[PDB]
Amino acid sequence: LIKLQIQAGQANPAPPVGPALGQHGVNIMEFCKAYNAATESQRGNVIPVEITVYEDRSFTFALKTPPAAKLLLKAAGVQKGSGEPHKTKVAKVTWDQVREIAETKKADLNANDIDAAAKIIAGTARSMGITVE
Amino acid sequence: MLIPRKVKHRKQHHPEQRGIASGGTSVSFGDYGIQALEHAYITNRQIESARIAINRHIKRGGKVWINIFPDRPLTKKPAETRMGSGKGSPEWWVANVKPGRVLFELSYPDEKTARDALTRAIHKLPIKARIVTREE
Amino acid sequence: MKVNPSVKPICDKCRVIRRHGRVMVICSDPRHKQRQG
Amino acid sequence: TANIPNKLTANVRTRTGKGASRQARRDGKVPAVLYGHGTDPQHLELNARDFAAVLRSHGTNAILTLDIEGTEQLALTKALDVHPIRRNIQHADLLVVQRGEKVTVEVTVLVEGDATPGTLVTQDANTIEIEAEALSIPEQLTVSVEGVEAGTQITAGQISLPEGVNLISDPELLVVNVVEAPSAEALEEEGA
Amino acid sequence: SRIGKQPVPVPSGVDVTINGQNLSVKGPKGTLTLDVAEPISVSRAEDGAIVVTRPDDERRSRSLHGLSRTLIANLVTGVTEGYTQKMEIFGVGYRVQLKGQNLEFALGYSHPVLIEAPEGITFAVESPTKFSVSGIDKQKVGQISAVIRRLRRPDPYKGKGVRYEGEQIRRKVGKT
Amino acid sequence: MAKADKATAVADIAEQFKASTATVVTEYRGLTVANLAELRRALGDSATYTVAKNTLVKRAASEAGIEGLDELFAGPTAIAFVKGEAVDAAKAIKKFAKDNKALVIKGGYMDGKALSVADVEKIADL
RNA sequence: GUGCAGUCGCGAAGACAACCAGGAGGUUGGCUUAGAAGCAGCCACCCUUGAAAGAGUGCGUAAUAGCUCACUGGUCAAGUGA
RNA sequence: AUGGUUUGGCACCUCGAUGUCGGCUCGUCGCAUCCUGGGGCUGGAGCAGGUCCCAAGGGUUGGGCUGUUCGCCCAUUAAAGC
């Protein structure tokens, strides 16, 4: 098992996606193309990946929802989050933007209802200092 | 490096080291403080080395109060000189400290870092000291 | 084996003991291993 | 706030002086005197351990009911004498008070809460003056600082006090001061 | 103490003889002798077990109690089960072959080294790069296993030398 | 865990159990939180899944008829309440047991009676 | 190191050590840099499943991976910490 | 803080005399070890090192310049100790 986050628009071999899983001994060229097809169906957001590997070097990848921080950054229109959270605030967010992200995270979260999921995103929004409304 | 701006007399008798402190025996500004336990002239530099030591450990937050000010001068005759021919020129400024005197006071959110920081300052002072807090 | 008048438990695994009247510090990491002398 | 008087046993002093008082301390007893509106100075020796226990629990301003040779007298701890180094209790002054009497004393102040992250909280004044009935004395007062921002001064008048309690000290005293947290640039400047 | 406050169970096949502070245990694997300290009294429960008792609670009795009890259990276990220490050798060209009661090691030295077995200890080689040492006394078994461990200096870079099976030796990397 | 917290934990477990129709005793040694979370997902829709201290339940059992489960607290204790329906969790716990096989159903309690592993399996079918 | 005495914490609702299991989702929290993922450094330091899981006490890695820990429950059986 | 060898402070023994620098000959003692002997840790792969601990048995060169102690330089040496 290995955890990585790869941008939607590129799958080149890189030190982050090279020796990270290369030392485990798994094929790389096949992985880039298969991941590319799914992430270019979405085409929108960077998608985290979790590669599951067996004893025969056969690998099954897990493609889940985009990161909450990147989801909140794109839901706010800003490029980079606040370097001084909760004192200097880059942007403002609305409940419906929170809920749609929470609904998106609901397939990826351990929450029960949307309300719990919304609070989880609210906690993430506080992490980089995005005020919630 | 604290020195008085001006002093009425520049050459003075050595401050005497008898008794224990009568005033300033209790922390007043901060929440923790360093209390002396032996008589010694806490000079000008030792205060600077200790105060810097506190700031390095507590980093950003907090405020430090220095209740001791070195305004009492001390003299030394020029090196390689026979005795006589008057009193030497003042050299270093010391502040007379008696047991019970509270030198430094430090205010910081968490206790553990504050006690460690004050402990480093103690190792830069000639006296045996102990850290004392505000309550009874 | 550092020989100093002051010996302290550098890391959490370090243990302070006493052998034959002399204080030591024994740790899995040999660098931390010191002795009072 | 009505509190129950603490019971102590006190006996009079046969000999008074630095010779006798030092020996009494060596025996585990703290010499004391008792004066009041009744105009009657009495010299007593309390047990040090129980007196320390009463003070530790009920604060420095403790209401007492002494037993002086079988007589019960209500007394208040006016003041103490703590040795600077040994931190003993060398001597205690006890003031007699009748129930329902207005007494002026000093109580401590505690700051409870969570300040904003960019804030350093400084307590200028440890104790404030209070006039209250002898049995209605509060052991300590509380000041709450939560979500307070910028330079906000919590003066003495702003404190909330129990019923029947008056603020003898003027309200202008600045008990709590909140300011912006110093930076490492600011720390390495003052003191030079 | 807690260790000393636990009776020593003697299985049915084991014989225990007590003469005051002198103790001797006889069993299938051989015979052993022991002596206990003055403060501790050693007596036998009629169930057929061993019990140790300390009269007072100072350092000496409290410290000696745990030792004296666990000294007997090692004594009884030695004469029923015995102790076998298993070793294994790492390195290229490192060989072990047994000669009589003695054991020989080929550790890369210009000459081969030989270890003689003292009384009550026996060496049994299983493979060229794996062997074992067996005996009665836990101390003597561990003692000779110590001496064998000192044959080659510790090697953090390649791990060549003697080892215990479960031993995990730290290794660094020699780059420059 | 203060003494007041220990006591109020008994009350909440008792309050939870009193409205709970039946209880199931299971063993959980060797189950990761993620898989445990799926069991929480497989049970939290209707039932309630909990793991509590052996003696904490014991005092939380003297009130009602779960005084007869004292012998089922030896070892790890995982208890399933069924506040909604009766057998809904009985199928789920068995299915989760078959999925993991690191889970052993120590026993169960229903309508004032205590049953063994086979018997609660019988009531799981019924 | 030990002798004495005094406070405070936890403890048969089984304390402490040890042994078994679990130690998670958002998530690679934002800034920062080549990188920076709990483990240069700075800011905040939350929410959720919940028994318990820290914006992570340490080691390890270029960065991941990995070993752990804090912490929770099970056996054990009177004391255990400052 | 040790040591008492350096530059000093004091003026206590000696001014009806305690000969003062270098070199030679002859030693003797300390260890705060230069080589040889035994170890720990290494940012110790090997050769070679670095630092620290134990150790005083033996050894510790010949020349150019200067009255020189000291120092620079030429050849060696296991080392050219204080």
Curated annotation (Swiss-Prot), chain B:
Q: Which CDD domains match?
A: Ribosomal_L16_L10e
Q: Where is the composition biased (Basic residues)?
A: 1-13
Q: Where is this region: Disordered?
A: 1-24
Checking InterPro entries in the record gives: Ribosomal_uL16 (IPR047873), Ribosomal_uL16_bact-type (IPR000114), Ribosomal_uL16_CS (IPR020798), Ribosomal_uL16_dom (IPR016180), Ribosomal_uL16_sf (IPR036920)
Query: What are this entry's molecular-function GO terms?
Result: rRNA binding; structural constituent of ribosome; tRNA binding
GO CC annotation terms, alphabetical: cytosolic large ribosomal subunit
Which named protein is this?
Large ribosomal subunit protein uL16
Q: Which domain of life is it from?
A: Bacteria
Q: List, alphabetically, the Pfam families matched.
A: Ribosomal_L16
Subunit text: Part of the 50S ribosomal subunit.
What gene does the UniProt entry assign to this protein? rplP
What is this protein's function? Binds 23S rRNA and is also seen to make contacts with the A and possibly P site tRNAs.
What keywords were assigned to this record?
Ribonucleoprotein, Ribosomal protein, RNA-binding, rRNA-binding, tRNA-binding
The family classification in the record reads: Belongs to the universal ribosomal protein uL16 family.
Q: Which GO terms describe its biological process?
A: translation
SUPFAM superfamilies registered for this protein in UniProt: Ribosomal protein L16p/L10e
From Swiss-Prot, chain C:
Keywords recorded for this protein, A-Z: Ribonucleoprotein, Ribosomal protein
Q: What is the top-level taxon of the source organism? A: Bacteria
Picking any one GO biological process from the record gives:
translation
The keyword Ribonucleoprotein is assigned to this record:
yes
Give Gene Ontology CC terms: cytoplasm; ribonucleoprotein complex; ribosome
Q: What residue ranges carry the coiled-coil annotation? A: none
For this UniProt entry, the molecular function terms from Gene Ontology, in alphabetical order, are: structural constituent of ribosome
Instruction: List the Pfam families hit by this protein, alphabetically.
Output: Ribosomal_L36 (PF00444)
Q: Cross-referenced InterPro entries, in alphabetical order?
A: Ribosomal_bL36, Ribosomal_bL36_sp
Q: Which family does it belong to?
A: Belongs to the bacterial ribosomal protein bL36 family.
Matching entries from NCBIfam families are given as: rpmJ_bact
Q: Specify the protein name.
A: Large ribosomal subunit protein bL36
Q: Which organism is it from?
A: Mycolicibacterium smegmatis (strain ATCC 700084 / mc(2)155)
Gene that encodes the chain: rpmJ
UniProtKB/Swiss-Prot annotation, chain E:
Select a single GO molecular function from the record's annotations and give it.
Answer: rRNA binding
Q: Give the highest taxon in the source lineage.
A: Bacteria
The reply on keyword RNA-binding is: yes
GO terms in the biological process aspect are:
cytoplasmic translation
Q: Which PANTHER family match?
A: 60S/50S RIBOSOMAL PROTEIN L6/L9, LARGE RIBOSOMAL SUBUNIT PROTEIN UL6M
Its quaternary organisation is: Part of the 50S ribosomal subunit.
Designated name of the protein: Large ribosomal subunit protein uL6
Which organism encodes this protein?
Mycolicibacterium smegmatis (strain ATCC 700084 / mc(2)155) (Mycobacterium smegmatis)
**Lineage of origin:** Bacteria, Bacillati, Actinomycetota, Actinomycetes, Mycobacteriales
Q: Which gene encodes it?
A: rplF
From Swiss-Prot, chain F:
Can you list the GO cellular component terms from the UniProt entry? large ribosomal subunit
Instruction: List the molecular function annotations (GO) for this entry.
Output: large ribosomal subunit rRNA binding; structural constituent of ribosome
GO biological-process terms attached to the record: translation
Please provide the record's keywords in A-Z order. Answer: Ribonucleoprotein, Ribosomal protein, RNA-binding, rRNA-binding
Q: List the disulfide bonds.
A: none
Family named by the database record: Belongs to the universal ribosomal protein uL10 family.
What function does the entry list? Forms part of the ribosomal stalk, playing a central role in the interaction of the ribosome with GTP-bound translation factors.
User: Assembly and partners?
Assistant: Part of the ribosomal stalk of the 50S ribosomal subunit. The N-terminus interacts with L11 and the large rRNA to form the base of the stalk. The C-terminus forms an elongated spine to which L12 dimers bind in a sequential fashion forming a multimeric L10(L12)X complex.
Give the protein name, as stated in the record: Large ribosomal subunit protein uL10
- Organism from which the protein derives: Mycolicibacterium smegmatis (strain ATCC 700084 / mc(2)155)
What gene name is given for the protein in this entry?
rplJ
